[PDB]
Design a protein around this ligand. Structure first.
Ligand code: AGS
Ligand code: AGS
Ligand code: ADP
Ligand code: MG
Ligand code: MG
Lengths: 486, 348, 238, 329, 257
């Protein structure tokens, strides 16, 4: 055992909930939830509380790193006399091993708690489990699906801790469990802690530089503690005389997300005469290099949804948008050449400049609305889902149509609509005899009739006309089709 | 109807008599027929003439087809499946189905059918070559094209390659050279009108005069299949009575492109460009080739009369540029939006 | 109104595991004699013909044709069996339990099975032929059969080398199964694909010996004694 | 049957020792002094194709150990797999043990390491310096950008300059000594100018013009034979075509171009390069002329690289030259 | 010409199985004395050297010394497709071409004639085993295999130390260590279990675990493995056959300390 060898972050860790600086409301809500979990379990979790918290069995912790998520989750379980079961990224987590190891500890009792203390009546929940799943983001080895399935068939407090909530892999956690958001604390919460540390270590700290220390490391208090500890070995006076070097040498190089990268590259402040030397082009290309999978899509999605501020004299908004789109097309050509054969990966920075930097710089200004999510990822999936159905229909009709999968969609389907659907509108339920004698000719079925109607666009929209015909003819057509043999 | 009234021999082709005579000439000595490549406008009647020559050189039982399924595997575990339209004398492939795995399909199936031979009874094995039909050869990938070009001369006494395609330009020079090139001109108005007259006297549709068929032929731009289909749709909507006053039924996408051109020529702003991108998304998402969208949009824009000479000239220049860019990319909307922005900047 | 009954599942399971690999759709016909199944390959290279005798209960009022996929039969047969079907057999029922299977429309033109003259007719045990095929398939992808001067020769010229196994007619009295019979009139030499024989030899478990019939211009006949005839087309030349 | 005379001239005259490596004197001298003093650091040869890198390193491996170089020396060319799973097992085991035959430092020759994945180079980055007192690495490359900066820094950079005229002349003389043959001085100058530094093209076209003599013992290889063997355009008709394009009208210029390019079966890709090399010497009294003159010609060359047409591109070259030589007036 | 008829069939199979997955390309030299071979590993660390005299062959005829290079993968493919009850004959023509492996049964006429196209391996014939070794020892194959495959689970390096009437195998890894110390002793009732040791100087040197695990695969041939160790010399692991011997020359791993 030793007291000095500690890492300055475990000797000063909060040992009680009244020491967690910042986000009082979130930790208070979580404490009330963990306290009323038993009362909500008595009502089978089917009665929402004052804040609507008793209807959720599992808790979710998300926020920027280094704020006290794990610390709060440990202290709230230690204060109520519970027992702490903690699984983390180092342990192997998969649907098999998760259903093997912790599934049995989901509805069982504690074996070590029974020997802890039972002579005095402290609390009735000193024999139960609180399973803390930490760092849910890292599931490189049933990472999110099985854990989300644990949120419904649970019988013990289930606290989950992650870093970023809106990531697509952890979407199932959306409405199956309660979630709370921990924010970056201000400079007023950690100031008392930092001054008390400075008092207990015989080294000066001006109360005026702590705000800059919190600003250079956005929301990681542990980073501030490590910064102070590393510098307090040779310099014991940290004031406004050397704060610039500290703030410049200890910056945080966080990775930017599709929303933030677009918001940054679309800001008209960098491409000005002053900002061009404070945020150089090398940094702009590194911004793309942080995520080369979504940045071009984001830029193509929201390059014309902003109000520029770098418009050259004479050049309007439409011309700038046109040049941005031309460079977008060129970057698309470069990207296709990159991801084609020969695996030309040395052409990446040219794509970074053509697809992202140039169209952004051309329409750089102040964004009017919000950063919209890219739409091409969903449109391509829809196009593929429709192409599958078109190929199926074409290979069903190949015996008689004698036309490619392209010439059928552009030409045949307009007349097939008149032949198939129109008799059901103008003639009613007595045209059921005619329509069938059509589809048996082209080997169609009910599934093909369901798909053919969905292709038409423009004035002819069938997804609304289908709801207009009576339901009795709908129920009779399927029966007539299933009854007769081909 | 489209599929019902179709010639099934060379003595029944009723348009382009010169091409029919040339096909009869090529059908005299079957054992010396080289590889063929048909090129011409879309819906000219290329597949029907191909299957008619194939019936003229083989027996009449070539029309009875059957669809089969073949499963291939790439270098990885991704298993692909293709449909083959086989007949006791030939087989038809549509290699354009696979995205970028055509090189595997060609070099596998063509080699497989070239090595071995055909046995069937209809004096147990002795037969002539086997025919492979390739639809939409213009969409073939360059490496697949090289494989197909090389699997032509090695095994020539067994496989005869009869390919068909419109807009023959994306065909490499070796394939263009090592095969015969046959052009299929679209039938004239005086012949498509006779085709329509035969259809209307056979199907017993009530028409007043011959001007309706002339208007249909003029609207179809020369396309026989689209003209027949529009005639059938007009007969269906007009309740078995064709009159001199009938609205020509343009397909839905044509009307969408026309409304798009109206929106373009009316309001030249980025706010209209957003709705233009939305319309292009809705169009591409419903299985419409981007090159056809671009061609229709540009021709309808040139159709607009309120634009002067310089506007139409710059429009056609930008269209040629973005059409060159369209065949060298994958994300087609990325080029279509740029072309729309350029035409908006041009108009004002 | 057809109904057939087999006392054990093994008789049908062996043949189904025998010919399920190459062809998936084979048309059966049932009459007063037996079950006559026919199918052609995807490339018209391997024509399969099955002949199942009724001696293995049988009742068929009129000869009728049916079609059923072998994959589902292989999955469900993973204890006597009885196959039943009624007039216009759109649904075939199987009792061990009840299993109903649907019929697929197959445009397979029934072709006649001819017993023509063959330049060579030999018979050799199945296990040895299977081993020879599995051993020559590792070298090349085309096996050459040459029957000359009362000698059989299987040749395989690959990239790493070339194998050649020659066999002479031999008869034994202690073991009547290990006998090689041969009847020759003309020296023949043909080539066949290795991936075809690699699955043809999978039917080695249904019988003890195989008959190989070679002609000048006719396809090769591989005969397994339920009777099973495979007509395999050779390679033309070069 | 098999003998030294059956090999092509590209390999038959391979330098056995370092003394038969001309041109790169300033690198061969340093390497010989390295091996003489006893110290030999990690080397990195970087040069154009066909300069002497592989020959130099093979001669060095022969000089260090003995006449049996491929015994205790490992050599990983582009023919073997060089993934991360290879640099982990094979290279590390070879660099972590001693030799089998003698007692010396081991040599590892990574030939054409530009074709290695970034992960493989990053893994090699530490094993190249962990075992230094026992093994030495020699990285041969042609493109100095495929290598990561870390691996590029750990090795001593030796650039292999293209062979100057004197070195190729000495090699031609040495080849003409061993093979009974005679070669003209103007033919020698044409061959030097056609070499472009490539020592392999020299020997190739030399074998060609020797084969095209019908008696390679008495008749001398004139310039016409060399120009015919490779089909390259002679400076005479090249300058004639350039003059006719610059001075004459359109019809006669197109006629003389089609007559020159069809008299010997020349190619437009070589005519463009020849005209560019001849015309780079002119003194254009403006900057806008050379800009277009280079841009249009480069576009035409890139289009020829795809083989679109054959006469449209020739008339395009004519038009580009004529339109570029118009801002001068 | 060259004709080598073995007495059995599985003999050559078991002989090749010793260095099946250890070397890839070998080159057999056939002379009037017998078949010799030596092949270097892919990483040039160990060398396999095999010598089989005319004692294991039922018939042997070789006029002039011939060299036959071939890969071991195709050779094992050819040996696997032969039944273990036939008689094997290696046949080579006047000039070195595709070697003919012929399997002929003893009861029924089954002629299996396989060809193997030769590789053109540079004939850098090596001459080792003339170097005076500092320490020699011999011990049963089962004990060596057990010790080595028990020590391989703790590390990747194995230090062999021959000291005064003591043999020490030491494995030092991450999870722990292990030390097996044996002493020379000879028994009269079981002469095959005796461990023999003749030393001149104490020798301590390290080897890798993968190469030892690949070498001990040859323990299926004989039962008494010989080990010859010497400073600045490749370790010799010898398995004695009934006609010749199979020897692995392993290179020791140097220590940075
Ligand atoms: N509000 C706070 N008041 C005091 N110390 C804090 C506070 N937040 C964090 N700490 C310190 O930070 C350390 C605990 O790290 P945590 O913030 O709990 O890590 P985390 O929240 O789980 O974020 P991750 O897991 O690294 S993404 C201890 O040294 C605490 O003293
Ligand atoms: N400096 C030289 N002196 C004499 N002959 C040379 C010289 N350089 C190249 N050669 C000739 O060119 C042949 C091949 O040279 P190499 O050194 O193998 O080429 P290289 O340096 O490996 O370049 P790469 O590998 O093609 S990029 C030799 O066998 C010689 O015949
Ligand atoms: N000589 C002809 N007489 C009548 N109809 C014809 C003739 N030639 C073509 N057609 C029509 O063309 C249609 C088929 O067109 P198709 O060959 O599929 O176009 P494409 O050549 O683009 O594939 C058929 O419906 C048929 O009625
Ligand atoms: Mg944590
Ligand atoms: Mg080299």
């Amino acid at each position: 055992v030793r007291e000095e060898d500690k890492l300055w972050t475990v000797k000063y860790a909060p040992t009680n909930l009244q020491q967690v600086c910042g986000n009082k409301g979130s930790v208070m809500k979580l404490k009330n939830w963990l306290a009323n979990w038993e009362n909500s379990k008595k009502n089978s979790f089917k009665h929402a509380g004052k804040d609507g918290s008793g209807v959720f069995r599992a808790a979710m912790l998300y926020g920027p790193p280094g704020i006290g998520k794990t610390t709060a989750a440990h202290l709230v379980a230690q204060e109520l006399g519970y027992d702490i079961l903690e699984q983390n990224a180092s342990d192997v987590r998969s649907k098999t091993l998760l259903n093997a190891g912790v599934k049995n500890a989901l509805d069982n009792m504690s074996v070590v708690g029974y020997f802890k203390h039972n002579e005095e009546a402290q609390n009735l929940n000193g024999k139960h489990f609180v399973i803390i799943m930490d760092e849910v983001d890292g599931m490189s080895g049933g990472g999110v699906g099985q854990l989300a399935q644990f949120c419904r068939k649970t019988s013990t407090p289930l606290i989950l801790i992650c870093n970023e909530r809106n990531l697509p892999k952890m979407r199932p956690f959306d409405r199956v469990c309660l979630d709370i958001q921990f924010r970056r604390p201000d400079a007023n919460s950690i100031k008392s802690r930092l001054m008390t540390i400075a008092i207990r270590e015989k080294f000066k700290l001006d109360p005026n530089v702590i705000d800059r220390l919190i600003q250079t490391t956005r929301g990681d208090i542990r980073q501030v503690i490590n910064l102070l500890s590393t510098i307090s070995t040779t310099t014991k006076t940290i004031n406004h005389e050397n704060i610039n070097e500290i703030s410049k040498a200890w910056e945080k190089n966080i990775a930017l997300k599709p929303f933030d990268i677009a918001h940054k590259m679309l800001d008209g402040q960098i491409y000005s005469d002053i900002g061009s030397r404070n945020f150089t082009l090398n940094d702009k290309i590194a911004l793309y290099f942080d995520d080369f999978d979504f940045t071009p899509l984001m830029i193509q999605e929201n390059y014309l949804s902003t109000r520029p501020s770098v418009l050259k004299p004479g050049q309007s908004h439409l011309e700038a948008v046109a040049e941005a789109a031309n460079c977008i097309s060129l970057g698309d050509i470069v990207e296709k050449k990159i991801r084609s054969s020969e695996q030309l990966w040395s052409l990446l920075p040219l794509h970074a400049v053509l697809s992202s930097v140039y169209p952004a710089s051309k329409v750089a200004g102040h964004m009017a609305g919000r950063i919209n999510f890219t739409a091409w990822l969903g449109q391509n999936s829809k196009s593929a889902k429709y192409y599958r159905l078109l190929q199926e229909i074409h290979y069903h009709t190949r015996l008689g149509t004698s036309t490619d999968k392209i010439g059928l969609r552009l030409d045949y389907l307009p007349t097939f609509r008149k032949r198939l659907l129109d008799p059901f509108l103008k003639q009613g339920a007595d045209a059921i005899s005619s329509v069938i004698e059509v589809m048996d000719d082209y080997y169609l079925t009910k599934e093909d009739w369901d798909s053919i109607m969905e292709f038409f666009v423009g004035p002819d929209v069938t997804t609304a006309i289908i709801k207009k015909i009576p339901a009795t003819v709908k129920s009779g057509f399927t029966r007539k089709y299933n009854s007769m043999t081909h | 109807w489209v599929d019902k009234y179709r010639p099934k021999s060379l003595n029944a082709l009723s348009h382009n008599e010169e091409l029919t005579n040339f096909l009869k000439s090529l059908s005299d000595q079957p054992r010396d027929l080289p590889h063929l490549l048909l090129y011409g406008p879309n819906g000219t009647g290329k597949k029907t003439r191909c299957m008619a020559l194939l019936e003229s050189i083989f027996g009449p039982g070539v029309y009875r087809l059957k669809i089969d399924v073949r499963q291939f595997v790439t270098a990885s575990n991704r298993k692909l499946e293709l449909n083959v339209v086989s007949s006791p004398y030939h087989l038809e492939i549509t290699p354009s189905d696979m995205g970028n795995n055509d090189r595997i399909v060609i070099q596998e199936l063509l080699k497989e059918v070239a090595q071995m031979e055909q046995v069937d009874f209809q004096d147990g094995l002795a037969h002539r070559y086997k025919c492979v039909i390739i639809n939409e050869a213009n969409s073939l990938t360059k490496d697949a094209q090289a494989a197909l070009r090389r699997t032509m001369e090695k095994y020539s006494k067994n496989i005869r390659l009869i390919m068909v395609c419109d807009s023959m330009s994306p065909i490499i020079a070796p394939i263009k050279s090592r095969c015969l090139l046959i052009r299929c001109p679209a039938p004239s108005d005086s012949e498509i009108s006779t085709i329509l007259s035969d259809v209307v006297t056979n199907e017993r549709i009530q028409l007043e005069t011959k001007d309706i068929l002339k208007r249909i032929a003029q609207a179809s731009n020369g396309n026989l299949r689209v003209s027949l289909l529009m005639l059938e749709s007009m007969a269906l909507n007009n309740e078995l009575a064709l009159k001199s006053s009938s609205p020509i039924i343009k397909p839905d996408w044509i009307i969408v492109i026309h409304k798009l051109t109206r929106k373009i020529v009316k309001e030249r702003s980025v706010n209209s460009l957003i709705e233009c991108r939305a319309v292009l998304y809705d169009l591409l998402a419903h299985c419409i080739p981007a090159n056809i969208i671009l061609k229709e949009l540009t021709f309808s824009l040139l159709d607009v009369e309120t634009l002067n000479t310089t506007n139409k000239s710059s429009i056609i220049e930008y269209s040629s540029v973005f059409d060159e860019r369209l065949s060298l990319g994958n994300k087609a909307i990325f080029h279509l939006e740029g072309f729309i922005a350029k035409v908006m900047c041009c108009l004002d | 109104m057809l109904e057939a009954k087999f006392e054990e599942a093994s008789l049908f399971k062996r043949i189904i595991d025998g010919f399920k690999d190459c062809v998936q759709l084979v048309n059966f016909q049932c009459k007063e004699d037996g079950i006559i199944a026919q199918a052609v390959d995807d490339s018209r290279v391997l024509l399969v013909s099955l002949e199942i005798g009724v001696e293995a209960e049988y009742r068929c009022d009129h000869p009728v044709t049916l079609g059923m996929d072998l994959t589902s039969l292989s999955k469900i047969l993973r204890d006597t069996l009885t196959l039943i079907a009624d007039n216009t057999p759109d649904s075939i029922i199987l009792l061990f339990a009840e299993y109903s299977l649907k019929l697929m429309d197959i445009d397979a033109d029934f072709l006649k099975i001819e017993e023509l003259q063959y330049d060579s007719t030999l018979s050799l045990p199945s296990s040895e032929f299977s081993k020879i095929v599995r051993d020559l398939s590792q070298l090349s992808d085309s096996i050459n059969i040459m029957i000359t001067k009362e000698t059989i020769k299987f040749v395989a010229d690959g990239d790493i080398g070339s194998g050649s196994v020659i066999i002479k007619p031999f008869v034994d009295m202690e073991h009547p199964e290990t006998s090689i019979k041969l009847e020759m009139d003309q020296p023949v030499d043909l080539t066949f694909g290795a991936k075809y024989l690699l699955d043809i030899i999978k039917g080695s478990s249904l019988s003890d010996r195989v008959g190989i019939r070679l002609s000048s211009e006719a396809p090769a006949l591989f005969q397994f004694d339920g009777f099973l005839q495979f007509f395999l087309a050779p390679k033309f030349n070069d | 049957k098999r003998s030294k005379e059956n090999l092509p001239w590209v390999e038959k005259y391979r330098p056995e020792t370092l003394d038969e490596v001309y041109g790169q004197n300033e690198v061969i001298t340093t390497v010989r002094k390295f091996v003489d003093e006893g110290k030999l650091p990690h080397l990195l040869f970087y040069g154009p194709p066909g300069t002497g890198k592989t020959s130099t390193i093979v001669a060095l491996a022969r000089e260090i150990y003995g006449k049996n170089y491929s015994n205790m020396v490992l050599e990983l060319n582009a023919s073997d797999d060089r993934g991360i799973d290879v640099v982990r097992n094979q290279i590390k085991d070879f660099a972590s043990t001693r030799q089998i035959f003698s007692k010396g430092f081991k040599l590892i020759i990574l030939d054409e390491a530009d074709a290695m994945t970034n992960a493989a180079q990053n893994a090699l980055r530490r094993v190249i310096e962990r075992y230094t007192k026992n093994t030495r690495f020699c990285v041969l490359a042609n493109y100095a950008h495929k290598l990561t900066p870390a691996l590029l820094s750990r090795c001593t950079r030796f650039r292999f300059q293209p062979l100057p005229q004197e070195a190729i002349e000495r090699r031609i003389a040495n080849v003409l000594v061993h093979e009974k043959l005679k070669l003209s001085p103007n033919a020698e100058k044409a061959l030097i100018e056609l070499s472009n530094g490539d020592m392999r093209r020299v020997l190739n076209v030399l074998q060609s013009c020797k084969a095209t003599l019908d008696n390679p013992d008495e008749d001398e290889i004139s310039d016409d034979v060399i120009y015919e063997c490779c089909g390259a355009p002679r400076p005479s008709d090249l300058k004639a075509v350039l003059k006719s394009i610059l001075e004459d009208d359109w019809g006669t210029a197109h006629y003389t171009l089609n007559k020159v390019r069809s008299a010997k079966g020349l190619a437009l890709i070589d005519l463009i390069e020849g005209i560019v090399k001849i015309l780079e010497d002119y003194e254009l009294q403006n900057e806008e002329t050379r800009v277009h003159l280079l841009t249009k010609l480069a576009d035409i060359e890139y289009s020829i690289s795809k083989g679109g047409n054959d006469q449209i591109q020739g008339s395009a070259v004519i038009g580009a030259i004529k339109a570029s030589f118009e801002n001068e007036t």
